[PDB]
Amino acid sequence: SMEMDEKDFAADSWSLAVDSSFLQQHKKEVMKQQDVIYELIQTELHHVRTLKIMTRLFRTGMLEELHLEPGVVQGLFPCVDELSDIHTRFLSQLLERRRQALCPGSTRNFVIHRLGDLLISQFSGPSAEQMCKTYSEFCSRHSKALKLYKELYARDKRFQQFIRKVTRPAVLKRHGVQECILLVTQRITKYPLLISRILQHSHGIEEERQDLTTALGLVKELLSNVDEGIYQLEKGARLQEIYNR
Amino acid sequence: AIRKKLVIVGDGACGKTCLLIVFSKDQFPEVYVPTVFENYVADIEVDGKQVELALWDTAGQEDYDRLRPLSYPDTDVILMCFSIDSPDSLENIPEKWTPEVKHFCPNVPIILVGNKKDLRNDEHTRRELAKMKQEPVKPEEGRDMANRIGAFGYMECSAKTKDGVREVFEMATRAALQA
Numbered sequence: 566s567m568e569m570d571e572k573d574f575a576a577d578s579w580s581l582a583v584d585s586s587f588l589q590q591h592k593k594e595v596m597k598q599q600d601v602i603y604e605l606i607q608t609e610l611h612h613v614r615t616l617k618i619m620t621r622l623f624r625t626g627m628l629e630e631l632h633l634e635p636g637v638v639q640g641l642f643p644c645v646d647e648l649s650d651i652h653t654r655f656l657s658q659l660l661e662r663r664r665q666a667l668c669p670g671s672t673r674n675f676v677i678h679r680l681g682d683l684l685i686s687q688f689s690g691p692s693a694e695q696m697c698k699t700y701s702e703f704c705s706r707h708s709k710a711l712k713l714y715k716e717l718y719a720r721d722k723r724f725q726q727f728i729r730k731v732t733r734p735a736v737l738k739r740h741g742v743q744e745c746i747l748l749v750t751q752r753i754t755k756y757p758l759l760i761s762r763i764l765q766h767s768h769g770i771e772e773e774r775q776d777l778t779t780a781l782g783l784v785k786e787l788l789s790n791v792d793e794g795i796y797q798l799e800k801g802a803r804l805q806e807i808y809n810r
Numbered sequence: 811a812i813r814k815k816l817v818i819v820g821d822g823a824c825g826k827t828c829l830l831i832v833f834s835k836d837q838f839p840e841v842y843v844p845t846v847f848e849n850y851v852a853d854i855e856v857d858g859k860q861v862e863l864a865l866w867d868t869a870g871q872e873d874y875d876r877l878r879p880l881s882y883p884d885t886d887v888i889l890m891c892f893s894i895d896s897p898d899s900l901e902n903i904p905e906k907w908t909p910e911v912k913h914f915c916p917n918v919p920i921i922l923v924g925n926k927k928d929l930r931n932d933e934h935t936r937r938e939l940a941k942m943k944q945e946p947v948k949p950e951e952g953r954d955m956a957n958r959i960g961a962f963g964y965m966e967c968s969a970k971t972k973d974g975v976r977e978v979f980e981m982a983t984r985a986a987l988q989a
């Protein structure tokens with residue numbers, strides 16, 4: 566991630582990110598709402614960073630240093646560019662809402678009052694169709710990606726050296742190839758938990774409570790559609806195994 | 811330092827997310843309790859052996875039967891959680907979770923963990939449960955369920971006070987290292 570955003574999201578909470586003199590100006594219920602919105606944006610920034618490790622560090626490094634057979638890099642990182650496009654756009658909208666809310670003369674003091682509408686937009690229309698199509702494809706290729714990775718790590722010397730080299734730094738401790746794939750698969754099921762807790766502290770403005778209630782319903786519809794469209798692809802599995810499922 | 815993978819399973823209200831957060835920070839959050847847990851790699855030394863233990867939560871995956879099993883590949887130890895303030899979470903252990911974990915994680919050790927043990931002698935908890943003709947899970951009821959499901963062992967902890975938390979993860983590491 567870029568330094569500006571890392572520093573803006575370095576604190577453990579919104580209450581520790583803002584100036585203490587600004588924090589004292591708000592009601593307890595507003596602080597609780599803002600701490601959960603801050604967790605949503607902070608975890609989205611980390612999720613976009615996970616996708617950049619996959620595209621820039623792993624995928625690009627394999628294309629430029631290794632001699633893998635055609636279709637091997639795509640098999641290891643299915644839909645990574647589409648996933649990166651979905652979440653970089655969503656992150657941009659979240660950070661723009663925070664930017665507009667900043668007090669003049671401050672780069673850290675803000676309150677986001679209107680998150681619901683942004684969530685309805687992200688989880689409806691063409692963007693929800695693209696998230697559904699992309700996650701149904703990615704999650705159906707999850708098992709195949711893990712098996713392909715294990716085969717290459719155990720049989721290809723240059724691939725093993727590459728992985729050991731690029732995952733050596735301490736900042737990559739939680740982000741090996743398989744770990745990135747599971748971080749991405751688990752991301753979509755974190756949204757209802759975060760949205761429901763934001764909703765719990767958003768009763769102050771009835772239109773906001775209504776918007777978050779609609780957004781939560783849309784996220785659950787998306788998850789149900791993705792879950793119903795998954796079937797693990799298996800390299801080598803015969804047609805008979807498939808039509809007899 | 812060998813790498814091992816741990817996954818925690820159980821009902822939405824079993825306290826699994828809180829347990830992972832408290833262990834990974836070695837502290838119950840004083841300012842903000844996070845809603846979610848991404849992942850973590852804990853450095854643990856148990857009985858003279860150094861291990862890198864990757865931690866994963868299944869929170870949010872309970873209603874999605876095709877997304878949820880994606881968390882299981884290559885798991886080395888399972889923590890199967892229930893809340894001591896909820897006899898209903900204990901009843902779902904042999905019903906749903908055990909046959910699922912034995913299917914996707916064959917021969918992987920399972921540790922049955924009773925969470926929120928601080929609530930066993932909490933007056934508000936005892937008054938609330940008595941309205942539905944219930945009581946906090948007794949330690950022997952936990953042991954019997956663990957024996958019944960063929961768990962590697964039975965343990966209890968409180969993420970609130972941290973008691974038993976270190977012990978749970980050190981024992982999980984020992985189970986992950988076994989043949």
Ligand SMILES: c1n[nH]c(-c2nccs2)n1
Nearest residue numbers: 875876879909910911913
């Ligand atoms: C056999 N026991 N449990 C299962 C499951 N399949 C999908 C989600 S749980 N198969």
